[PDB]
Amino acid sequence: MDFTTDKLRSMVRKWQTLIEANVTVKTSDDYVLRIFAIAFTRKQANQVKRHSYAQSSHIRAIRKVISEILTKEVQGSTLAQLTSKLIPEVINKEIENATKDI
Amino acid sequence: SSVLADALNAINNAEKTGKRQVLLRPSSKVIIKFLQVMQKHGYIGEFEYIDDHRSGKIVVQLNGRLNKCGVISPRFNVKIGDIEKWTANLLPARQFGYVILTTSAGIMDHEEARRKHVSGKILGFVY
Amino acid sequence: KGISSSAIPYSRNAPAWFKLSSESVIEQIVKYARKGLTPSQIGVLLRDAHGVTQARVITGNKIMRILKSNGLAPEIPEDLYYLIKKAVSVRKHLERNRKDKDAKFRLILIESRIHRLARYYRTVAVLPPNWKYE
RNA sequence: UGGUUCUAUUUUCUAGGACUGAUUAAUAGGGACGGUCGGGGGCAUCAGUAUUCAAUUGUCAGAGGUGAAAUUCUUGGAUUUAUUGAAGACUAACUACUGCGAAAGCAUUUGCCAAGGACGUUUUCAUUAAUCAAGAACGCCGACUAGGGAUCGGGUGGUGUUUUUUUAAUGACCCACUCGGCACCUUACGAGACUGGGGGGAGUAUGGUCGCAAGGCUGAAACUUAAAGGAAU
């Protein structure tokens, strides 16, 4: 699976940070997959400072929980189960819910 | 730098910038006597020694009448016969300002020193 | 340079809620020192848990004098000891990996700082002369 | 730790003797601690897609490159396309009048190794300090007042929204204050006294000195001399 280049070029904006992670996970079959992840630091509503950067320890902690919960979503899936899991974009919702604490 | 020199530097350039109060820290007996003789001649107003337990602070109030403080950094001895010569060589004019000396009878200006007839080492000037 | 130090109060009394004894503090001090803590650690533990503000105020004198009068003197002052062990930790790092030019530079700085207060302590003769840093 | 002897009920309690004696705690300096902070360093690890090369297909006549061309490769299949491998680098956008480092400099992940700074501190030492010739490592000004907006790191307080719950602790934003930084925009006030060098800028003249430079068809001069060429026609 792969994005088009225009999608992530349409996502990258300055005055934020992109946290990107990747893990090499073997599924419940013996397929081994290198699976990536990108995420961009939002600014809250009522935020008046123009930056909304992460403090790089928040980046390490966010990237840690990204790696842990998506290597939990693999190993607990086959290829067909993982494909049906990442069609309706719901591992992204798992990452968002698990990371809004940070 | 010294401890009398930076106090007199603060009390100089604060008055040049036109403030009505200086806070100078730290504070010694020689600083108290120097401000004592210059308020005896009317260059500063009141001043107050806030005692913290470290070394002391002074808040001087000063109106307009000073235009230069200083210290003479080698504390050379002067004589009663050469008080007039040293005032002539370092003061602005003939009767303009006072040279302040550390004497046997304490910190005094030059004209009080030669009034009660005692010499000493030079400390600094005010005019 | 930054201004971040501790601000000693103007009072020199016990704070009038300090109901403990002026001797049980000394017994706790010598107990912690004999179980093996540096005097700064004695002071911070005594301040945090058994709430003596500072022991020069609440006891008679400062706690290195308390330890030296109760027999628990240091071999070498705490400043020199901590700088010595930091210098030898950097020296073992340098023998381990030898392309750390920045850590060589910090070793030159730490060794200069060793020599400065070792010279001070030697002219005071806290520690004996003919002391070298090995 | 050792030893001597004094009081009343088989064992209770006792008295004495030999192996320290000045201040603070600098909006000076150092050291410890705490939660941290950073693209500071070293080692190891991980990834990324380009590029180059190679293998395998598919297809066929061109591909580079230039202002045009050319050297070069190419029916023994170049360029293009797809799959895969190998190599050496490099760390795109995020990336900033931001950060860190003594400077040169430093940008992928994770871990280890030591380090460092700012902050917090009712911790500790107590003048241990500042500047630089020599030497060593790496390689509009100042002694000067106030501010203002924005930003980076820490801290305190407030009390709303994102957060959330009996697994650990831990956020993000808003506001005020405060400390310390990289800058920016202003203000007020001060004597602030890899070594070797002729003398301003723009020009002008030259009966001086040192140079370089003209003539005149070539051949062709001792020879009025060929062929051929030039010029004008």
- Domain ends where: C35, C55, C73? C73
8 A C-beta contact, residue A29 and residue A46: no
Helix (H) or strand (E) holding C129: none
Same domain, yes or no: C78 and C65: no
Tokens of B15: 């008055």
Strands B77-78, B69-71: pairing is unpaired
What letters, b where the CB count within 10 A reaches 16 and e where it falls short, cover B72-96? Answer: beeeeebeeeebeebbeeebeeeee
Same domain, yes or no: C93 and C124: yes
- Chain B closest-CA separation from residue C72 CA (Å): 30
Same domain, yes or no: C87 and C118: yes
Comparing alpha-carbon positions, the chain C residue that sits nearest to B50 is C10
Q: Which nucleotide minimizes the distance between its C1' and the CA of C123?
A: D128
Q: 10 Å Cβ neighbour count for B36?
A: 15
Same domain, yes or no: C32 and C66: yes
Domain region containing C41: 19-73
Same domain, yes or no: C78 and C110: yes
Cα(first)–Cα(last) distance of chain A, in Å? 28
Same domain, yes or no: C52 and C84: no
DSSP A64-90: HHHHHHHHHHSSS--HHHHHHHHTTTH
Name the β-bridge partners of B22: B60
Q: How many CA atoms lie within 13 A of C6 on its CB side?
A: 5
Q: How far is the CA of C6 from the C1' of D25 (A)?
A: 11
Determination approach: cryo-EM
**Sequence letter at residue A22:** N
> Resolution in A for the shown PDB structure?
8.6
Same domain, yes or no: C134 and C80: yes
In a domain, C11, yes or no: no
Which residue bears the tokens 């008080």? B83
Written in H, E and C, the secondary structure of chain B is: CCCHHHHHHHHHHHHHCCCCEEEECCCCHHHHHHHHHHHHCCCCCCEEEECCCCCCEEEEECCCCCCCEEECCCCCEECCCCHHHHHHHHCCCCCCCEEEEEECCEEEEHHHHHHCCCCEEEEEEEC
The set of strand D positions with any atom below 7 Å of a protein CB reads: 20, 23-33, 36-43, 46-48, 93-96, 101-103, 108-111, 113-129, 137-139, 143-145, 150-154, 160-164, 170-175, 179-181, 188-190
State whether residue A95 is helix, strand or coil: helix
8 A C-beta contact, residue A69 and residue A63: no
In a domain, C5, yes or no: no
In a domain, C61, yes or no: yes
Q: Looking at residue C100, which CATH number applies to its domain?
A: 1.10.287.10
Same domain, yes or no: C28 and C68: yes
Please give the tally of structural domains in chain C: 2
In a domain, C7, yes or no: no
In a domain, C3, yes or no: no
On chain C, the residues whose CB falls within 8 A of the CB of B53 are 8, 10, 12
The CA distance from C110 to C93, in Å, is: 14
Same domain, yes or no: C69 and C102: no
Same domain, yes or no: C122 and C78: yes
Same domain, yes or no: C36 and C63: yes
Same domain, yes or no: C84 and C59: no
List of residues 6+ apart from A64 with CB closer than 8 A = none
